[PDB]
Amino acid sequence: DYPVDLYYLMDLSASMDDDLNTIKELGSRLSKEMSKLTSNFRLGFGSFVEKPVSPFVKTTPEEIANPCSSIPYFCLPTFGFKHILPLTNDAERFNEIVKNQKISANIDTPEGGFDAIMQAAVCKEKIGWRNDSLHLLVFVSDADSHFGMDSKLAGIVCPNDGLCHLDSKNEYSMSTVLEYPTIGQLIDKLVQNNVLLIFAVTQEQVHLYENYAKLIPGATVGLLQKDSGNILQLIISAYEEL
Amino acid sequence: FNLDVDSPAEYSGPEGSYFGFAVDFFVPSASSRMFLLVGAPKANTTQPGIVEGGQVLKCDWSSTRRCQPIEFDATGNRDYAKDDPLEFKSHQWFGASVRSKQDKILACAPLYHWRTEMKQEREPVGTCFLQDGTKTVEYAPCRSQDIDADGQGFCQGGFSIDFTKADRVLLGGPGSFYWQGQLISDQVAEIVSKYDPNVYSIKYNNQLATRTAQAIFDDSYLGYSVAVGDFNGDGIDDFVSGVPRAARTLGMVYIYDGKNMSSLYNFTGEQMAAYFGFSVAATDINGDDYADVFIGAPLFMDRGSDGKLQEVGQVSVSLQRASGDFQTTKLNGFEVFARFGSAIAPLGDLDQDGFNDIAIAAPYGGEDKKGIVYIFNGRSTGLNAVPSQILEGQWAARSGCPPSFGYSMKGATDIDKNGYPDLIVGAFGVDRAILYRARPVITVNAGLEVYPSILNQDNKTCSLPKVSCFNVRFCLKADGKGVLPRKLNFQVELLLDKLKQKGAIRRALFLYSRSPSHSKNMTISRGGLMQCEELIAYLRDESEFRDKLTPITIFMEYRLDYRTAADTTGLQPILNQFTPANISRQA
Ligand SMILES: *[C@@H]1O[C@H](CO)[C@@H](O[C@@H]2O[C@H](CO)[C@@H](O[C@@H]3O[C@H](CO[C@H]4O[C@H](CO[C@H]5O[C@H](CO)[C@@H](O)[C@H](O)[C@@H]5O)[C@@H](O)[C@H](O[C@H]5O[C@H](CO)[C@@H](O)[C@H](O)[C@@H]5O)[C@@H]4O)[C@@H](O)[C@H](O[C@H]4O[C@H](CO)[C@@H](O)[C@H](O)[C@@H]4O)[C@@H]3O)[C@H](O)[C@H]2NC(C)=O)[C@H](O)[C@H]1NC(C)=O
Ligand SMILES: *[C@@H]1O[C@H](CO)[C@@H](O[C@@H]2O[C@H](CO)[C@@H](O[C@@H]3O[C@H](CO[C@H]4O[C@H](CO[C@H]5O[C@H](CO)[C@@H](O)[C@H](O)[C@@H]5O)[C@@H](O)[C@H](O)[C@@H]4O)[C@@H](O)[C@H](O[C@H]4O[C@H](CO)[C@@H](O)[C@H](O)[C@@H]4O)[C@@H]3O)[C@H](O)[C@H]2NC(C)=O)[C@H](O)[C@H]1NC(C)=O
Ligand SMILES: *[C@@H]1O[C@H](CO)[C@@H](O[C@@H]2O[C@H](CO)[C@@H](O[C@@H]3O[C@H](CO[C@H]4O[C@H](CO)[C@@H](O)[C@H](O)[C@@H]4O)[C@@H](O)[C@H](O)[C@@H]3O)[C@H](O)[C@H]2NC(C)=O)[C@H](O)[C@H]1NC(C)=O
Ligand SMILES: *[C@@H]1O[C@H](CO)[C@@H](O[C@@H]2O[C@H](CO)[C@@H](O[C@@H]3O[C@H](CO)[C@@H](O)[C@H](O)[C@@H]3O)[C@H](O)[C@H]2NC(C)=O)[C@H](O)[C@H]1NC(C)=O
Ligand SMILES: *[C@@H]1O[C@H](CO)[C@@H](O[C@@H]2O[C@H](CO)[C@@H](O)[C@H](O)[C@H]2NC(C)=O)[C@H](O)[C@H]1NC(C)=O
Ligand SMILES: *[C@@H]1O[C@H](CO)[C@@H](O)[C@H](O)[C@H]1NC(C)=O
Ligand SMILES: *[C@@H]1O[C@H](CO)[C@@H](O)[C@H](O)[C@H]1NC(C)=O
Ligand SMILES: [Ca+2]
Ligand SMILES: [Ca+2]
Ligand SMILES: [Ca+2]
Ligand SMILES: [Ca+2]
Ligand SMILES: [Mn+2]
Ligand SMILES: [Mn+2]
Ligand SMILES: [Mn+2]
């Protein structure tokens, strides 16, 4: 018997409409099996897309408020990272959030996943990490992710300090101001906060992200299927501790 | 080692403008004055309605340290039609990359957006302005009819630039073909001749371009950095470019022929997301007339002694051979998170030793993450892995961007005609550029003869009202290689029987000076002949000291009066590093 915290980081990018219904079936299913092996269970939620700056998103007045234009389709505007749910015991509130999630969009296939990982890791307050618990961070995206110095194209040359930059809207306010974090920076902040990063991607993205998990200590990888109980098999076989 | 850090020239631009984001030199027609070219891509200009268009400033070295803006474009946004703006020059980052060749200055705006000529878009195709004296022309090879992300709409042409030796421009466009990237090369004779202010998509016949490939190569960022040099042994400068996201973020470097745009050689990073290819440079470092490839990976993580990973950055040094192969070594950075390898500037032969040298910057290293530039010297076997000089940042980081001292730099240009190439270092985070002048290097060969070696206890020979004496002959010769005066004034000190600390019993002192030490001001001429001088010292009597076991070491020390060897610009020379010291012998 031991307390466990689990944050659910979902990618709301455009490439996730084909995988959306599998992610919601992962939320509710995970919001059930967690109460089994432990009684001290609190879970949270966060969403990300991309940095809202050219060239990653078109800068036309219509495609800013509706980046799914020219398709046509109505979707949420492009945002860096939004912290929606601080981790709490209320697990039926978690489900109610995943259901209402709509798709967003951008242009370039890799996304700003690392921005969301960095902000959720360092912020021990606005996310609410326990003192002595298993800080698990499930990462879900069906594409690659941008790292350091890639924002130079956008005109962003101030590096990421790896600090808590969530505004009153609980969003990444310093997303258009700071670069993406590098793997070195993530490793330096996933240990200071002691966070186990679980990669949950698609088949074509595993061979890539598995080499990322080799660099990041403790970080493992996982596959996304219609029966998303596989990723649950990780967590159950991660409660081994010892 | 010979860079003057005592009195460097400090140039400044408007605050908050990222002054120093790109730097270069300026050497116009005939034997004129020389200038510094500094980029400030976030600088507000006087352009109507254009907010933070950016500018490139011409700063004068001759004296006074005053900077003057270069008028590349004074106009605002052209209209395609009424209430239908054609372009967006606001926040276009003009001056993000500056490259100069003789009286030619090429500056570019990577974040320049342009509206399609078919419909109302805002696509960042990038544009450049070229100045060959008076005439100013525009250059936008990605502003074409190949629109949208699938084409050149997000090309961002001019993100990196360079010149060849045959008047060809090399442009990098990381966003072309759904961010596959593209390299475009045009002859300067065609750029100005085919320029038309009423034509927004100019097609050039002698254009060399990397055409679109399969969809797996999307999101590769070909053209992120560029450099030029001959590699296939023909005489035409070939195109080297970093592809940092290729090979699943392993990073690669593509080499293309500078005549028909064909792939010649490849390099591949060895660590995921190390940004292998962030910066590249090409210069012959080992004196074989074959340009050598320097690839920076500022995000490279190495393993520490404790088993913990640490991000230090890595630069790979690849020596070109006539047999086609490459001898590659790797140079790891010194400070964690410093991003060693972010900028690589060939320096020429900084110290005029016969082998080119190079600088590598760690813009976020040093105390308070201010910035460090490391100087590396070449040799017959290649690059010296240990730096001979460390350039330290002096400017603290106000809130916002770090000083980023070293983030961009350029060398191999002798701006003060002193015989040595100098170095410009940009620090855009504090809107500053600093000129470091190379000090002349003096090689000194000192000699010391003591005859006889064995002093008898009673050998009276030299005239005196006669005691056991001997001749001390010391020779001195100096030389330099550059613009330095002929007459170098040396102040030489000699100390007999130094081994005896102050308070002990001394046993030697000169014959006429009557003093264990003799001072002498010595004007010697470099290059002429070795000037030597003899003098007689004697030993004390037996009854004056029972200590006949402590060997008497004759110590010779020499130094220079830099002030009388300084230049009109106040640049004081400096001694070569491995052998500047004094010398000792013993009797
Ligand atoms: C250093 O490393 C780098 C990186 O690895 C390397 O550079 C790459 O080298 C590889 C070498 O193989 C190059 O790969 C070649 O790419 C050719 C692409 O050019 C033509 O082919 C296009 C193919 O279309 C693809 O997509 C369609 C679906 O859309 C698909 O059906 C096709 O099968 C194919 O996958 C073609 O479309 C394109 O045509 C353009 O223009 C026409 C108009 O004429 C227009 O209609 C098109 O829409 C398009 O806009 C273009 O002409 C490719 O042809 C070539 O194919 C060879 O290999 C295959 C597989 O083995 C054979 O079956 C085939 O017969 C050929 O032999 C090959 O795949 C890659 O392009 C390089 N990348 C660059 C340059 O950026 C360097 O070479 C390395 N250095 C060294 C020294 O090796
Ligand atoms: C785009 O441009 C590139 C170069 O700009 C063109 O690439 C050229 O292809 C031709 C083939 O059509 C090659 O010529 C061959 O030369 C052979 C003899 O070797 C000579 O070339 C060597 C090149 O240098 C070498 O070292 C460098 C390292 O510095 C390597 O990178 C390089 O690959 C070379 O290995 C010289 O060093 C050497 O001294 C020689 O001078 C010939 O044997 C060969 O075939 C001839 O003979 C055949 C029968 O024997 C006959 O049938 C043929 O018709 C032909 O006459 C051929 O001549 C060039 O060497 C090569 N360039 C370079 C720089 O290597 C590319 O073809 C072009 N593409 C298009 C579409 O135009
Ligand atoms: C007792 O002390 C005596 C004086 O201190 C010692 O006499 C010395 O003996 C050595 C030989 O061992 C002499 O050295 C020789 O010098 C000649 C000539 O060199 C000179 O000439 C050139 C120009 O031609 C000039 O540039 C030089 O500066 C010299 O002035 C050399 O050619 C020989 O090879 C040889 O080395 C000394 O010159 C001599 N001293 C003096 C003052 O003449 C004597 O040896 C001591 N006795 C001992 C130790 O038992
Ligand atoms: C270049 O010029 C532009 C203006 O043409 C400058 O942009 C201006 O930036 C300031 C702050 O840097 C903005 O003022 C701010 O307003 C808020 C109120 O909303 C206030 O609380 C802040 O304290 C601050 O005063 C100003 O609105 C903005 N102007 C425009 C037109 O957007 C820019 O800073 C200049 N840059 C350089 C390098 O000179
Ligand atoms: C003559 O100059 C040399 C310079 O090489 C002096 O050697 C230094 O000695 C001190 C302590 O003895 C060391 O801390 C330095 O590192 C030495 N210098 C170098 C370059 O290694 C030597 O001391 C001088 N002679 C005398 C008598 O002081
Ligand atoms: C536990 O949390 C409290 C506040 O909730 C804090 O004061 C204390 O330092 C924490 N202990 C450890 C070991 O982190
Ligand atoms: C040599 O010049 C120095 C000044 O550089 C002076 O202090 C010294 O007295 C001079 N020595 C002689 C012997 O004239
Ligand atoms: Ca060539
Ligand atoms: Ca070489
Ligand atoms: Ca040298
Ligand atoms: Ca100089
Ligand atoms: Mn996506
Ligand atoms: Mn999908
Ligand atoms: Mn994206």
Side-chain angles (χ1 to χ4, degrees):
Chain A
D1 187 25
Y2 187 80
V4 164
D5 298 336
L6 190 272
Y7 198 89
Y8 199 75
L9 196 57
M10 193 208 297
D11 176 29
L12 284 184
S13 66
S15 51
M16 290 291 300
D17 177 80
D18 51 325
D19 322 309
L20 178 62
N21 58 328
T22 57
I23 299 318
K24 300 184 184 178
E25 277 196 14
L26 176 52
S28 66
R29 192 173 185 176
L30 175 142
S31 179
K32 165 64 183 178
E33 310 292 334
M34 279 302 299
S35 179
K36 293 297 180 61
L37 249 179
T38 180
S39 51
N40 316 113
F41 155 70
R42 298 189 308 181
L43 85 174
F45 176 78
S47 55
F48 67 95
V49 183
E50 191 70 279
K51 292 187 177 298
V53 193
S54 201
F56 304 140
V57 194
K58 276 191 175 58
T59 43
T60 57
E62 176 182 350
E63 204 164 327
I64 300 176
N66 182 36
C68 298
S69 180
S70 172
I71 305 175
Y73 186 69
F74 181 82
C75 62
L76 309 183
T78 307
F79 56 88
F81 158 70
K82 291 183 178 181
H83 175 56
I84 303 184
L85 180 62
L87 60 98
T88 182
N89 292 86
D90 200 18
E92 294 301 322
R93 186 58 182 272
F94 169 81
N95 294 335
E96 292 162 11
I97 298 173
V98 190
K99 302 158 186 177
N100 309 15
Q101 289 297 334
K102 299 185 186 63
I103 321 99
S104 301
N106 66 106
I107 313 178
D108 71 335
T109 310
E111 316 296 9
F114 292 165
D115 271 23
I117 301 179
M118 175 61 72
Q119 296 304 310
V122 184
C123 299
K124 290 179 175 179
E125 307 168 357
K126 310 191 71 173
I127 275 72
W129 297 104
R130 264 181 178 106
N131 270 353
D132 310 88
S133 71
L134 301 183
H135 309 149
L136 312 182
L137 214 167
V138 165
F139 179 79
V140 173
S141 67
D142 70 334
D144 202 330
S145 55
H146 286 285
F147 44 94
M149 289 159 150
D150 282 329
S151 54
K152 179 173 167 54
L153 309 175
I156 313 175
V157 290
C158 299
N160 193 275
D161 52 9
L163 296 178
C164 193
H165 293 293
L166 299 177
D167 48 18
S168 55
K169 296 179 180 179
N170 281 324
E171 310 178 18
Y172 195 3
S173 62
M174 308 294 289
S175 182
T176 71
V177 197
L178 310 179
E179 296 178 352
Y180 304 90
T182 73
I183 296 189
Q185 298 183 34
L186 287 172
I187 290 178
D188 189 37
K189 283 298 173 179
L190 285 182
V191 182
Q192 289 179 10
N193 318 319
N194 188 30
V195 182
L196 295 182
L197 187 57
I198 295 177
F199 288 140
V201 299
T202 52
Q203 296 194 20
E204 65 278 359
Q205 227 67 24
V206 175
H207 188 276
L208 194 165
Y209 278 68
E210 186 181 359
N211 296 131
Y212 286 176
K214 295 181 181 182
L215 305 181
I216 312 179
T220 71
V221 284
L223 187 59
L224 230 316
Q225 291 185 352
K226 294 181 180 179
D227 290 327
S228 55
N230 204 25
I231 315 177
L232 301 186
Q233 285 186 7
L234 288 167
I235 318 179
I236 301 180
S237 55
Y239 199 72
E240 302 171 352
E241 306 189 60
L242 295 181
Chain B
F1 62 97
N2 53 323
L3 283 175
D4 179 70
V5 210
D6 297 344
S7 55
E10 176 173 346
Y11 297 84
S12 61
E15 82 170 10
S17 63
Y18 288 5
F19 179 85
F21 189 89
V23 300
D24 203 88
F25 294 87
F26 189 30
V27 45
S29 305
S31 54
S32 304
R33 291 168 302 109
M34 298 254 186
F35 300 94
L36 297 84
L37 295 182
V38 186
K42 278 194 168 181
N44 277 314
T45 67
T46 60
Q47 291 163 347
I50 303 189
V51 42
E52 291 189 348
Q55 56 187 4
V56 175
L57 290 88
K58 185 194 62 176
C59 301
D60 176 45
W61 160 240
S62 71
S63 190
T64 321
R65 316 275 181 90
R66 286 180 177 174
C67 299
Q68 268 300 332
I70 304 179
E71 186 182 3
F72 284 95
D73 173 41
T75 71
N77 295 16
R78 283 171 298 187
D79 276 315
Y80 172 88
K82 182 186 176 185
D83 302 282
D84 201 27
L86 174 78
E87 53 195 359
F88 308 90
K89 290 173 183 176
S90 292
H91 310 292
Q92 72 185 343
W93 278 64
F94 175 73
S97 67
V98 187
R99 282 305 101 91
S100 190
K101 179 184 183 299
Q102 305 163 5
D103 67 329
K104 307 173 180 297
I105 301 181
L106 178 66
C108 296
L111 276 177
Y112 163 87
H113 298 70
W114 150 87
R115 168 201 179 277
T116 305
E117 202 174 5
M118 291 159 188
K119 291 185 176 180
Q120 288 172 17
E121 297 291 340
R122 190 167 192 271
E123 300 184 351
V125 294
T127 188
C128 303
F129 289 93
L130 176 60
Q131 184 165 352
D132 191 79
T134 71
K135 305 293 174 52
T136 299
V137 305
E138 194 180 16
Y139 179 60
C142 285
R143 192 177 66 198
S144 188
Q145 309 308 131
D146 188 23
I147 68 182
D148 213 332
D150 313 277
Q152 298 173 353
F154 287 70
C155 159
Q156 302 188 252
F159 191 75
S160 61
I161 46 177
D162 210 341
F163 283 103
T164 70
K165 190 164 173 184
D167 299 25
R168 295 194 73 115
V169 168
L170 172 59
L171 177 144
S176 288
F177 313 138
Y178 246 109
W179 291 273
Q180 290 184 19
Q182 189 179 20
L183 302 185
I184 298 186
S185 185
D186 282 290
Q187 296 171 351
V188 304
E190 196 181 15
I191 297 178
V192 51
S193 72
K194 292 304 181 305
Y195 171 67
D196 275 333
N198 55 326
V199 182
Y200 313 136
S201 296
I202 304 179
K203 196 49 185 177
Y204 309 96
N205 43 272
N206 301 324
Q207 188 175 339
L208 295 180
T210 52
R211 296 175 177 87
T212 172
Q214 298 86 333
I216 191 185
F217 297 105
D218 294 354
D219 187 44
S220 289
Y221 293 3
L222 166 64
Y224 194 88
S225 62
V226 292
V228 299
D230 190 17
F231 290 99
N232 52 342
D234 75 327
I236 303 300
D237 277 14
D238 302 314
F239 306 142
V240 185
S241 186
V243 200
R245 285 192 63 89
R248 276 65 92 81
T249 70
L250 222 43
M252 293 185 71
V253 165
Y254 296 161
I255 294 192
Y256 294 92
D257 183 34
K259 191 185 69 177
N260 55 24
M261 202 57 88
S262 181
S263 187
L264 293 183
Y265 295 97
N266 278 337
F267 301 90
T268 310
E270 300 283 4
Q271 185 179 96
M272 303 285 182
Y275 236 84
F276 183 86
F278 178 81
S279 62
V280 289
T283 174
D284 179 34
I285 208 73
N286 53 332
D288 50 334
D289 301 85
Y290 286 139
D292 305 317
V293 181
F294 298 86
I295 305 171
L299 308 183
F300 185 89
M301 310 181 67
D302 171 75
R303 188 66 79 173
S305 303
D306 37 33
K308 195 186 298 300
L309 293 171
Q310 48 172 25
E311 179 188 348
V312 296
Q314 187 183 74
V315 174
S316 64
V317 185
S318 303
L319 272 54
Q320 181 187 172
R321 308 288 183 178
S323 299
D325 312 276
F326 285 86
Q327 307 194 329
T328 303
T329 169
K330 281 170 174 51
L331 189 59
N332 285 13
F334 309 90
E335 281 197 34
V336 196
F337 297 156
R339 296 190 186 182
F340 178 89
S342 297
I344 309 174
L347 307 178
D349 201 345
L350 184 62
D351 48 320
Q352 294 295 63
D353 58 17
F355 298 104
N356 286 330
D357 312 313
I358 204 150
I360 305 174
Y364 312 109
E367 56 176 21
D368 209 339
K369 305 214 304 176
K370 287 185 197 183
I372 302 289
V373 175
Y374 299 95
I375 310 305
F376 297 99
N377 296 90
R379 45 192 182 182
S380 64
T381 319
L383 188 63
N384 189 11
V386 289
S388 61
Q389 192 169 10
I390 301 90
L391 270 52
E392 292 257 3
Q394 307 293 342
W395 307 263
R398 328 157 188 176
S399 48
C401 263
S404 308
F405 177 85
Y407 183 82
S408 60
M409 45 190 193
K410 190 72 208 310
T413 297
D414 186 21
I415 203 177
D416 64 336
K417 300 289 298 181
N418 83 325
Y420 299 82
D422 311 83
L423 168 65
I424 304 172
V425 177
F428 69 86
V430 289
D431 306 287
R432 218 77 60 103
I434 308 94
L435 177 69
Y436 292 97
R437 296 183 289 144
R439 298 162 61 184
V441 181
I442 312 296
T443 293
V444 48
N445 285 126
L448 189 58
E449 301 175 20
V450 178
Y451 46 92
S453 57
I454 42 181
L455 306 180
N456 189 268
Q457 186 51 56
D458 182 82
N459 176 26
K460 297 165 296 186
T461 304
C462 55
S463 53
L464 186 73
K466 279 57 71 180
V467 70
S468 300
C469 56
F470 57 96
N471 299 90
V472 180
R473 184 172 181 266
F474 60 97
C475 299
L476 202 53
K477 185 175 71 62
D479 198 36
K481 196 168 185 179
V483 174
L484 57 155
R486 349 202 180 275
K487 304 302 176 180
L488 305 171
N489 283 236
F490 284 81
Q491 188 187 3
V492 182
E493 321 293 326
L494 267 61
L495 307 163
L496 297 168
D497 194 30
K498 183 187 181 64
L499 265 42
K500 291 295 187 178
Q501 297 287 351
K502 189 53 180 299
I505 169 67
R506 199 75 61 167
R507 299 157 300 178
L509 66 95
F510 291 70
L511 184 62
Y512 207 4
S513 181
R514 320 300 201 88
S515 181
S517 52
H518 178 266
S519 182
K520 178 62 191 297
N521 291 327
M522 214 188 170
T523 294
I524 77 175
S525 66
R526 98 184 196 281
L529 304 170
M530 184 187 305
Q531 276 176 336
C532 203
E533 165 174 325
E534 194 189 357
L535 205 59
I536 298 181
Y538 71 96
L539 176 66
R540 287 196 173 73
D541 184 85
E542 182 178 1
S543 295
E544 298 188 350
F545 65 98
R546 47 181 190 263
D547 196 339
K548 288 95 166 180
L549 304 320
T550 302
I552 303 182
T553 295
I554 294 86
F555 175 76
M556 170 184 168
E557 178 185 11
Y558 56 90
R559 303 182 167 178
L560 176 53
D561 199 334
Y562 307 92
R563 302 193 186 188
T564 194
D567 204 31
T568 178
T569 65
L571 203 54
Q572 315 177 354
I574 191 58
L575 294 174
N576 186 259
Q577 56 137 344
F578 210 59
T579 328
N582 48 40
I583 48 178
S584 62
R585 204 187 172 182
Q586 58 186 9

